Amino acid sequence: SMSYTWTGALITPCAAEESKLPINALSNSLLRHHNMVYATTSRSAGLRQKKVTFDRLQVLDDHYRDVLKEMKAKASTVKAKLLSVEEACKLTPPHSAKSKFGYGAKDVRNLSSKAVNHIHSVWKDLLEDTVTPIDTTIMAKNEVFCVQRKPARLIVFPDLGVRVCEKMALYDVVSTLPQVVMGSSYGFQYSPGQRVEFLVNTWKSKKNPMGFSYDTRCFDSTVTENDIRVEESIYQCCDLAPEARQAIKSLTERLYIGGPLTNSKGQNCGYRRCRASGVLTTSCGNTLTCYLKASAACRAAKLQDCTMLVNGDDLVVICESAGTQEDAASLRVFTEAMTRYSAPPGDPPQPEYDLELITSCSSNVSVAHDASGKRVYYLTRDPTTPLARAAWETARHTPVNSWLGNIIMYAPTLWARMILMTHFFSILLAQEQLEKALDCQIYGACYSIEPLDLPQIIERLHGLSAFSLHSYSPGEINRVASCLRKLGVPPLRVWRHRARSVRARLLSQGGRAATCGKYLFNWAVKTKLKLTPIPAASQLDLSGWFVAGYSGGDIYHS
Ligand SMILES: CC(=O)c1ccc(-c2cc(NS(=O)(=O)c3ccc(C)cc3C)c(C(=O)O)s2)s1
Ligand SMILES: CC(=O)c1ccc(-c2cc(NS(=O)(=O)c3ccc(C)cc3C)c(C(=O)O)s2)s1
């Protein structure tokens, strides 16, 4: 079974595409080596098509079935509700792709009769037809990176009407089931601090810890019909209304298992027989399937007390070491088993004995010290991509503000604090847009956030320690300094000066702005302040922020 089959029609763009970093009067203050940054375009779609097109083979043994039976037993305890049309509509992002049937995200969010009527019609069709493949659009994603160039990734999604129907039938399922089936192993239930806490405690739970990350080669393409039907059988274990059962069966047969691909010009590009990257179940399905295969593989490889952390296709395993030589052999067997389950590795997995050396979800655990000198572990990552994207956002407004999402997720880091916060608050101040809400993404879901609320948000997600970390590790320091040299990003003395300036402007503004100045830039002054809990913090409603992953799920909140 080929992951895809093609007709020859090109994967066309839906709008003008820029590959080179746009430059304005602000660019240089952040990055000088402009030619290092680029954005992927449909022009490289061909290359990607060749990488994601291959045959899949699967040999399922008793370990696989034993793990599956256990997962289904847990899924049976779940009771999920069918969402109402209005509820599903409110979860639609304001700028989500418009329907091909005469209405857009705006009409959906406002519950217009035209949109609500078509949605209802699509729903009825799902109930009465469980065989006809549903159309999907295939587009080349425009993503920014630093060279040393990768081809654009591909996104496959059904019409807006179908997406609302997916929410109605499955939102409650994909939001509640993974945590029940996988418990503490389900990664999306954790905020960055909780993820670090889980990784550290798990590591400490082993007499002689050993860990490794497992990178599957183009995971979506390795997902087979069997995998997708297996996922449906797990969903069906839930206590569901009969109408929901029918809808899930229908969406599985007509959309999740596969279907035709249509480019932006309306031409048939081919056919998909693997995971669709732009459906509501993409994250939950990848997570369940990755966890199923990995769990079974741990048994085949005989790993001791293998604890796992799964986020979609991202997998991290921490177990009890049985000796260096043996761990290496076990990992080999693990990879062989994963391969038999149609989850071949991209990069061969290697055993690590230093927690901080394991990268998962493009991040790693590191350590610093708080105002009290106490050791504190936090999540960080290589800042190259975040900075390249920040450069792009410096001269171009985008649907998703990566800089804001990165400040929220990596607030305790040296780079997010010194550069991202300083640079963007400087711009927000000059343009008087501090109070303007911006969209960013957390675990795949889109959120509208006011920059002025960052202090509270950071306090709630990372704790006051995020505003006073210091004495970072040499490893982290060198990686940050190397990245800055590579990109041609100005040094500390420059950022410290800009930070003091920004901090002074914010303080004068008063209100929330002053709070931003005091907490976000305390590191920039020589005579540090108090920094005590923020009252308004408790006000913020962060429920649903770290519950589940919705990558490509077309999900919006507030
Ligand atoms: C290349 C480069 O600019 C740098 C390399 C290492 C640097 C570092 C500056 C520090 N100290 S600091 O100047 O007080 C500082 C600056 C900025 C923030 C957000 C926090 C703190 C505590 C470091 C540390 O304490 O570990 S590492 S700065
Ligand atoms: C307290 C603390 O750890 C720090 C305070 C300021 C730091 C800084 C370290 C730097 N550079 S470095 O690449 O890390 C570096 C290069 C060469 C040597 C010989 C040493 C270093 C550290 C800074 C800068 O470039 O502005 S500030 S690091």
Automatic annotation (TrEMBL):
Disulfide bonds: C298-C306
Subcellular location: Host cell membrane; Host cytoplasm, Host perinuclear region; Host endoplasmic reticulum membrane; Host lipid droplet
Domain RdRp catalytic, chain residue ranges per copy: 209-327
Subunit structure: Homodimer. Interacts with host SPCS1; this interaction is essential for viral particle assembly. Interacts with envelope glycoprotein E1. Interacts with envelope glycoprotein E2. Interacts with viroporin p7. Interacts with serine protease/helicase NS3. Part of the replication complex composed of NS2, NS3, NS4A, NS4B, NS5A and the RNA-directed RNA polymerase embedded in an ER-derived membranous web. Part of the viral assembly initiation complex composed of NS2, E1, E2, NS3, NS4A, NS5A and the mature core protein. Forms a heterodimer with envelope glycoprotein E1. Interacts with host CD81 and SCARB1 receptors; these interactions play a role in viral entry into host cell. Interacts with host EIF2AK2/PKR; this interaction inhibits EIF2AK2 and probably allows the virus to evade the innate immune response. Interacts with host CD209/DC-SIGN and CLEC4M/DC-SIGNR. Interact with host SPCS1; this interaction is essential for viral particle assembly. Interacts with protease NS2. The heterodimer E1/E2 interacts with host CLDN1; this interaction plays a role in viral entry into host cell.
Record-stated family: Belongs to the hepacivirus polyprotein family.
Role this protein plays: Induces a specific membrane alteration that serves as a scaffold for the virus replication complex. This membrane alteration gives rise to the so-called ER-derived membranous web that contains the replication complex. NS4B self-interaction contributes to its function in membranous web formation. Promotes host TRIF protein degradation in a CASP8-dependent manner thereby inhibiting host TLR3-mediated interferon signaling. Disrupts the interaction between STING and TBK1 contributing to the inhibition of interferon signaling.
Name this polypeptide is given: Genome polyprotein
Native source organism of the sequence: Hepatitis C virus genotype 1b (HCV)
Taxonomic lineage: Viruses, Riboviria, Orthornavirae, Kitrinoviricota, Flasuviricetes
From-to range in the entire protein, with total length: 2420 to 2982 of 3010
